[PDB]
Amino acid sequence: EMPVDRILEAELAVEQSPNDPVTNICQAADKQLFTLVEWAKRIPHFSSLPLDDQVILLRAGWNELLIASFSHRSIDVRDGILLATGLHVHRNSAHSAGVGAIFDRVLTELVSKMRDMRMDKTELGCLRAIILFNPDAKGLSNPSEVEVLREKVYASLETYCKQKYPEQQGRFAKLLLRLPALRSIGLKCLEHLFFFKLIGDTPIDTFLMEMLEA
């Protein structure tokens, strides 16, 4: 039904002049937007909800999905994060660009804790499936279908944490206590992309642009 290996597979398949940090970030978000859809498509079952649902969930869930993915990929960067493009952003620039406070928030609540615990790649893939399967999304034909699928991940993942890590008692809850901060953090990051789009002075690209015009 929701097997954890078919999730990590996806986690894996998607596996990879001047630098302004916001120009670099936006380019990076766009790049990834494309491969988001390709990661989505390999989530057991995602393929199969109605179009209009598949499109509400990628719209509602994309920013929190890119973030988790980059914090996770940023584990051995220091005071920083590693763009899909290879370029980096570090606190100094984050702070310059006015994004100081959630940038550190991203560092402290995600990159770091994703270090301290050594969250492995299945665990990430599953955290991202749980994220993608978002039953509060305004517009869904069948919110309980979405939620049943979600709950398929919860049981797959708990089960899995009892396999790979039987000595860590609550690791499954440690895993999910990341998603509430992921959510506040992701709401704030968006208000910044919104304000960067409106000033116009930051170069947005085709795909991310569509994501940002409701």
Partner: peptide
Amino acid sequence: HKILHRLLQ
């Protein structure tokens, strides 16, 4: 919309 759709197809 437009772009997402056709990738989802």
